Structure formats: structure tokens, C-alpha cells
Structure 1
Amino acid sequence: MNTVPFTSAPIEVTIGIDQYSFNVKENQPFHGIKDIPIGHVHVIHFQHADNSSMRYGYWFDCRMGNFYIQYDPKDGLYKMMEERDGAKFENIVHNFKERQMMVSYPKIDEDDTWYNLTEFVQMDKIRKIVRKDENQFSYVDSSMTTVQENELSDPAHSLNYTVINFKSREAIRPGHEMEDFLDKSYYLNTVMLQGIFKNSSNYFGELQFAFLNAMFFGNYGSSLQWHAMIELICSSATVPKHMLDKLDEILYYQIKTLPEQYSDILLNERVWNICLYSSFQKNSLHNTEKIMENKYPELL
């Protein structure tokens, strides 16, 4: 069980750690989060009480180093930092735990929610979507744009999600215009799965990361990407059977975890109605269809 100590909390801020969140007061003696489960990526995230705009945060994996948070009064944000000196870091944490100045990652044992949301998400894949190679962790925020959004302006600050575009030469084989447009299977299976992602785990990983950035940061381009990756599968007539079953589980937990009061903006009416009710896979998402009907029947 790993720990992310905080130097201090000089400004009042709501701190999230995965799907949990805590309110910390200005100069409250808060010095970090302990008992973080090993084996999964995690995200720590922030929303300042005084500017509820720019949710921001850091994706990390404690297996990859010792990470701590420190507030920067010049740039005005809580920053993640890697500590290279293990004895320093262990001594700092030891002290902080003894003074009981850390909150505990509040995981219920029966609960697989975080695993279910991050099953296919790897740090190494995150770091290719978010390019800042001098760090082992990845910063994301509300305002960052995606490469696709950019094409339609600062490249070093972009979300390099895989570009999906149903009316592109990449998606449409010459001579199979109608076929490929009405059945996206060649674009899913050959172009995307066999060519770019190499396997369905990496595809689901990026789908899951996109959803999490949409939920935690309100990142709109990530929400576009999540929906595009769902639509590409549902709009294919030929999908490996293990993928459809996995997809139904993935989306179920995503819909389960979404704040009830955010359905209006995080859920695209067109995509969901097409996926659950009109697409080839309209009958392959029983768990997702059932939770969506009982929780958000208005959207549909």
C-alpha cells in the first residue's frame, strides 16, 4: 500500500483520488493520502474552491516511483513531483503517518469499482496519449484539447488519442464506400484493432482513459473520444464475441459511476440511442442497456 505525501495545503481545494474526494481547508494540516492500492493506475485531482474552473490532476502508478504533491504559489497549482531519494521519501512518509496527518484511500473490500474502470488502462499507454517524457506521471485538465480537435493549437499540451473519423479515407476502402460506411467492421478490425491498437485490450484501455478524463475533468474532447470508440464497435457487424461481452461490462461500470447530475453533458443522446437501439450490437449490451434505462430513461 503506497503513499503520496503532500508538502502542505495552502489553498482551499477539493482533492480527488480516483472516485473519492475530500474537501481541504486553506492551510489545513493535510499531508497526503496513504493506503493506495498497488496494481492499478490512479489519478489525484484538484478543484480550487476559489476558481471552480480548471479541474486538473495527475495519473500515476506507485510502482513506477515515489510521488509527492507540492503547491506552487507562482503557477498557482498543486504539482506532482517524483522524489529520487527513497530513504528521504520513506522518512518523510513515516513521520507523516505517525502524526496521523494523512487520509486513507477509502476502499471497501467488496468493491471492484476502480478495477472495473481501469481494467485495461496502463500507465505506459497513458504516457503516449499525454506526452511529457521527463515525468513518470501525466497531467490532464479540463481545457486540454485532443489532436483531432486541433486539426479541425499548442501541440505539446494535447491529448493524443487515436483519431477516429467515419468519413475519412482511413475508414472507407475505395470501392467499398457503402459497405464500409454502413458496416464499420473493416475499420474496427483491420485498421484499428489489427493495425493501430494491435489488440482489444489497448483499445479498451484508451476508451476507459477517455471516459475517466471526461468524468473527472469535464474534458470535452475526451468525451468525444469515448463516444467515438463506443460507436465504432456498435456500428460494426463483425466484432469478436469476447469484445462485446467485455464492452458491456466496461460501459456498465462507467454508467454506474457517472454522477447522476452530469448525464446531460457527458452522455451523447445520438450515440447511445443508436448503440443500444439501432446498431448491429443493439442486442449485445444487456447490462449497459438495463442500467441506462433505469438510471437515464430521459436521455433515451
Structure 2
Amino acid sequence: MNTVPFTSAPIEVTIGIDQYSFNVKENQPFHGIKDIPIGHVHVIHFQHADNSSMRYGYWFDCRMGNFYIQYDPKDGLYKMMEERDGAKFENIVHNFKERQMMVSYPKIDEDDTWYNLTEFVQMDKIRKIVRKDENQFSYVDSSMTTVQENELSDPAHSLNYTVINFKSREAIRPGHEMEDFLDKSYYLNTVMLQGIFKNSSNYFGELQFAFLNAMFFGNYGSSLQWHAMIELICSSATVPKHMLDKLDEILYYQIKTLPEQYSDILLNERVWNICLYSSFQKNSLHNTEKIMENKYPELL
């Protein structure tokens, strides 16, 4: 069980850790989060009380280093930093820990929610989507745009998701125009899976990361990416059976975790109705269709 200590909490802020969140008051004695499960990526995220604009946060894996948070009064945000002095870090944490000034990652033992949302998400792939190579952790916020959004403006601060575009030469073989547009299996299986992602685990990992950035930061380009990756599978007549069964589980837990009051802006009516009711895979997502119909029957 690992720890992310805080130097202090000088400004009032709602702090999220994965799917959990809690409020910290201005100058409240608060020195971080303990008992963070090893084996998963995690995200620690922030919304200031005075400016609910800009949700921002940091993806990290405690196996990769000792990380802490420190507010920067010049840049006006809580920053993640790595502590290289391993003994300095252990000593800081233990002091905050015998003084019980940290909150405990509040995992119920029955509860596989975070695993189920991050099953295929790896830090090394996150760091290729979010390029800042001198840090082991990755910053994301509400306003960051994607490489594809930039093609339609600062490249260093972009989300480099894999570009998916159904009306592109990459997606459409000369002479198979109608075939490839109406059945996207070539683009899914040859171009994306064999060609770019190499395997379905990396595909699902990017899909899961896109969803999480959409949900936690309201990042619009991430939501676009998530829906494109779903639609590419659902619009393929030929998908490996284990991928469909896994997709159904992935989306089930995503739909289960979505705040009820954010469905209006985070769920694209066209994609979901197409995927569940018109697409080749309309009959292959039983768990996802059932939770969607019982939780968001309006959208459909």
C-alpha cells in the first residue's frame, strides 16, 4: 500500500482519487492519501472551490517512483513531483502517518470497480498519449485538445490519441469503398489491431483511458475518442469473440460508474443507438444494453 503525501493544502479544493473524492478547506491540516492499492494506475485530480473551471490531475503508478503533491502559488495549481531521496520520502510519510493527517484510499474489499475500469490501462501507454518525458506521471486537464482536434494548437500540451476517421484513405481500401465503409472490419482488424495497436489489450487500454479522461476532466476530445473506438468495433461485422465479450464488460462498468447527472453531455445518442440497435454487434453487448436500458432509457 503506497502513499501520495501533500506538502500542504493552501487553497480550498475538491480532491479526487480514482472514483472517490473529498473536500479540503483552505489551510485545512491535510497531508495526503495513504493505502493506495499497488498494481493499478491511479489518477489524483483537482477542482478548485473558487474556479470550478479547469479540472486537472495526474495519472501515476506508485511502482514507478515516490510522488507527492505541492501547491505552486505562482502557477496556481497543485503539482505532482517526484522525490528521488528515498529516505527523505519514507521519513516524511511516516511522520504524517503517526500524526494521521492523511485520508485512506477507501476501497471496499468486494469492490472491483477500479480494476474493471483500468484493466488494460498501462502507465507506459499513457505516457505516449500524454508526452512529457521528464516526468513519470502524466498531467491532464479539461481543456487539452487531441491531435485530431488540432488537424481540424500547442502540440506539446496535446492528447496524442490514435486518430480514427471513418472517411479517410487509411480506413478505405481503393476498390472496396462500399465494403469498407459499411463494414469496418478491415480498418479494425488489419489497420488498427494488427497495424497500430498490435493487440486488443492496447486498444482497450486507450479506450478505457479516453473514457476516464472524459469522465474525470470533462475532456471533450477524450469523449470523442472513446465513442470512436466503440463505434469502430460495433461497425465491424468480423470481430474476435473474446473482444466482444470483453468490450461488453468494459462498457458495462463504464456505464455503471458514470454519474447519472452527467449522461446528457458524456453519452452520444447516435453512437449508442447505432451500436446497440443497428450495428453488426447489436446483439453482442448484452450486459451493456441491459444497464443502458435500465439507467439511461431516455437516450435510447
After TM superposition, the score normalised by the length of structure 2 is 1.00
Alpha-carbon distance, 1:116 to partner: 0.0
| In structure 2, distance between residues paired with 1:104 and 1:296 | 33
Aligned partner of residue 54 in structure 1, secondary structure: coil
| In structure 2, distance between residues paired with 1:126 and 1:64 | 13
Alpha-carbon distance, 1:162 to partner: 0.1
Match of 2:169 in 1: 169
| In structure 1, distance between residues paired with 2:110 and 2:280 | 35
| In structure 1, distance between residues paired with 2:30 and 2:108 | 23
Alpha-carbon distance, 1:218 to partner: 0.1
Alpha-carbon distance, 1:221 to partner: 0.1
| In structure 1, distance between residues paired with 2:292 and 2:177 | 33
| In structure 2, distance between residues paired with 1:161 and 1:222 | 8
| In structure 1, distance between residues paired with 2:271 and 2:143 | 23
Q: Alignment length, in residue pairs?
A: 300
Aligned partner of residue 139 in structure 1, secondary structure: strand
| In structure 1, distance between residues paired with 2:270 and 2:206 | 21
Alpha-carbon distance, 1:117 to partner: 0.1
Aligned partner of residue 244 in structure 1, secondary structure: helix
| CA shift digits 1:22-59 (9 cap, x unpaired) | 00000000000000000000000000000001000000
| In structure 2, distance between residues paired with 1:106 and 1:278 | 41
Alpha-carbon distance, 1:279 to partner: 0.0
| In structure 2, distance between residues paired with 1:72 and 1:277 | 50
| In structure 2, distance between residues paired with 1:140 and 1:98 | 32
| CA shift digits 1:145-194 (9 cap, x unpaired) | 00000000000000000000000000000000000000000000000000
**RMSD, matched Cα:** 0.2
Alpha-carbon distance, 1:277 to partner: 0.2
| CA shift digits 1:215-242 (9 cap, x unpaired) | 0000000000000000000000000000
| In structure 1, distance between residues paired with 2:119 and 2:284 | 20
Match of 2:8 in 1: 8
| CA shift digits 1:211-270 (9 cap, x unpaired) | 000000000000000000000000000000000000000000000000000000000000
| In structure 1, distance between residues paired with 2:28 and 2:288 | 42
| In structure 2, distance between residues paired with 1:283 and 1:40 | 32
Question: Where do 4+ consecutive residues of structure 1 move more than 6 Å?
Answer: none
* Structure 1 gap ranges (5+): none
Aligned partner of residue 282 in structure 1, secondary structure: coil
Match of 1:84 in 2: 84
| In structure 2, distance between residues paired with 1:28 and 1:276 | 48
Percentage identity across paired residues of the two chains: 100
Match of 2:149 in 1: 149
Aligned partner of residue 21 in structure 1, secondary structure: strand
| CA shift digits 1:120-166 (9 cap, x unpaired) | 00000000000000000000000000000000000000000000000
Match of 1:193 in 2: 193
Match of 2:204 in 1: 204
| In structure 1, distance between residues paired with 2:30 and 2:194 | 47
1:272 aligned onto 2:272: yes
Alpha-carbon distance, 1:63 to partner: 0.1
| In structure 2, distance between residues paired with 1:242 and 1:287 | 15
| CA shift digits 1:99-124 (9 cap, x unpaired) | 00000000000000000000000000
Alpha-carbon distance, 1:289 to partner: 0.1
* Structure 2 gap ranges (5+): none
Aligned partner of residue 58 in structure 2, secondary structure: strand
Alpha-carbon distance, 1:3 to partner: 0.1
Match of 2:256 in 1: 256
Alpha-carbon distance, 1:86 to partner: 0.5
| CA shift digits 1:51-109 (9 cap, x unpaired) | 00100000000000000000000000000000000000000000000100000000000
Aligned partner of residue 74 in structure 2, secondary structure: coil
| In structure 2, distance between residues paired with 1:88 and 1:24 | 26
